[model samples]
Target: DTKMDPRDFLQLLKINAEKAEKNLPLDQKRAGMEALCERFPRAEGVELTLTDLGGVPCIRQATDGAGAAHILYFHGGGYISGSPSTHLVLTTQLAKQSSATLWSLDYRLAPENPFPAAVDDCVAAYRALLKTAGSADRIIIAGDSAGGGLTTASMLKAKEDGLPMPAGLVMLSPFVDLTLSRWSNSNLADRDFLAEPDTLGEMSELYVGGEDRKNPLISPVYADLSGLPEMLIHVGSEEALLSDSTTLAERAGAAGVSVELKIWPDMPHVFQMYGKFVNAADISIKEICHWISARIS
Candidate 1:
């Protein structure tokens, strides 16, 4: 397996951390993402479309007209920020590389719309996509951070409903535990560029909306993983949610689920958003697409 040189990786991470710190405000972060997406439009052969998914906004993009495979993507933002627009660039690249239609859902966020709202919106969008696309065998669910949590939760919900499981799942720095009990949460408290426990925990609390933190649908690490689709997870060693990914992978493996966890040392959460400037981001995107392709085939 190829590995990034430790020194070079740390240097890159330092640069990204500086950039992330400079844009700490939520609106500023959202604007930066929108600007980035506009600046780096999808490559040729790719088509982007924005539509409504069961009353929630969603973005769909594809490089091919064929509908053999579809991806249901949940966006990260601690379930308080992020939307189809902010996440367009990443999803477009995912669609191009995976050669699959990508649906990025706009789940409701917390404080105003919390807990079951985001989960409900995600599951509703997936169900709507399954119906609209006309098949579940070729579908895969994916997300980053909070979206990762939702992705796993949606799968569990589908299983309970007896719906056909997706072809697989791909998680990018998934926030699997709402209880926030991971040791990394404390260890990386000062280094995590994108999230702080106080703010993130508050957001998580609002999203849960008084629900039990241990509820499997809200915090998938507590759920049954057996019989779920194959999963590929990527996380950064410096991020607070690092252990969430590790714990989820271990639990899934023990439950007989096929899972692979990729730990990127010194990188921040969802570093793939820096695809334009970061080689690591590009490689992560390609690897995720390759994994999705393998499962779809």
Candidate 2:
């Protein structure tokens, strides 16, 4: 296996981004990204299965056995892009690490589906999984970037609907504050390679549009956050969303939810997903897997 030097890999990504900013139409761009990312990291022992969760498409990967716990994952693409296939490598790696099955849901996207659709589908998927997989307490809900924010929103929705909450949540560089006014955003703007604060601000408009963007579920960091399950959050030092993760931990902790937040110095957002090149990715995943085991038990 080839290892990516963090510096070179990070540089490559920046160059990729510079080039990715192009004139392709929406559909073409989505297709192009998914097609390429799917081939990035080849993983083994991942058995893929397709199914429906509350009218939403889902891809379930069982990397090990029919274990005691399941991971319900939502892929992050600013809530406008990203499908299960786009994140298959990392999703399956999660399953392998936790010794359980992980289901990645392709929830509705923004500028087309808009706010509430993605949140509704995510909450529905969790409810459906409870019936066929295991009880709520036996599952872990995880996501990265925008999906990380979804991870928390789903819990809030579950709480509102009087449903059982999951055992834990794993949020990576969460886009918790859609308002995009967090202090770290300005501080880290010059350092981040992806998910720039300026870019996310525009994306946020497309996501919420005419809807109430400040609704707790829409921008979860602004929510009450009380009674939510234990949470494990990871953010990179150079990320534009650094304050989102740090603030969420403090907010959730203040609301009495158990929280573990780690900020990796000099790392970019969602760095854990690039395991083929980033050694930090493996370190993060291993720690997360061990945490998943303890949470499920």
Candidate 3:
């Protein structure tokens, strides 16, 4: 059977346990991210820039020059924290492998800004990209965790609003079921490293500002999957979100959409962040890029 080495998996679990213990405030999180970018400058293949989508500021980076395809990225922080800086390393690696320019959006978070704002920023960024650079058929929308939820929600909104759908999507450890109704919620309770049903439930409550948790935008597992573009899903085997990925793939497949699901053994939520230290992350990026390249080619 395929399995991760117990020792290496334990080390990652230890790191995640430490991270979970200290939930830094948003400003502090942003400050730390700024320092991280300065500490680790972009690799040779990347160039960074900032743009305003509607009134929201977005941080973007691209490989040397533009390519035929574009990647619209959303950073993950449970709909409350994280920025493009926190995601720079992974996004840079994606740009290198996908051979496409990446626009990492800085969407509005909750508590200060609640539901629809985050989705609004994402849609605006996508629309702006479609209007200026290329058609929707050449763009791929991608995100991790809450960003993954937003990716599908935004696509649903786009479909409802008559906007063009992107060529594809990439979801990593997606938190699609905010209602916490899936069997994986209880089954993976002891295995998840980054999230628990209780913690996610609390965050979802705060993000929706007391709205219905089952709302399609908040819990995209319940959303309509018909007519969406092809999707690539990657999730850790041990994560609570594993069922989210599985169910989404099944639902999309039933709807006649193309879907690929890759489950990595013993990794935690959005394991791609460990690209600097994990071979699994590298392999995942290579696979995703190959998929993107094929679609455009």
Backbone clash numbers for all candidates listed: 1, 0, 0
The Cα local distance difference test for each model comes to: 0.81, 0.86, 0.80
With candidate 2 superimposed using the best TM-score fit, by how many Å does residue 220's alpha carbon deviate from the native? Answer: 0.9
Candidate 1 lDDT (Cα, 0 to 1): 0.81
The model with the greater TM-score, 1 or 3, is 3
User: TM-score of every model?
Assistant: 0.88, 0.96, 0.91
Candidate 3 ranges beyond 4 A from true positions: 1-9, 15-26, 29-42, 196-198
RMSD values for the candidates in order, in angstroms, are 3.4, 1.4, 3.1
How does candidate 2 fare on TM-score? 0.96
Using TM-score as the measure, the top candidate is 2
Report how far off residue 103 is in candidate 3 (Å): 0.4
lDDT of 2 by residue, 64-146 (tens): 56587889999998988888998887888888878888889999998899888999999899889899775887899999998
> What tens digits encode model 3's per-residue C-alpha lDDT throughout 184-271?
8888877776665547767666688777777888887777789999999998877877889998888889988899999997677888
In model 1, which runs have C-alpha deviations exceeding 4 angstroms? 1-41, 64-67
- How big is the positional error of residue 3 in model 1, measured in Å on the Cα after superposition? 16
**Deviation in angstroms for 90 in model 1?**
1.3
lDDT winner, 1 or 2: 2
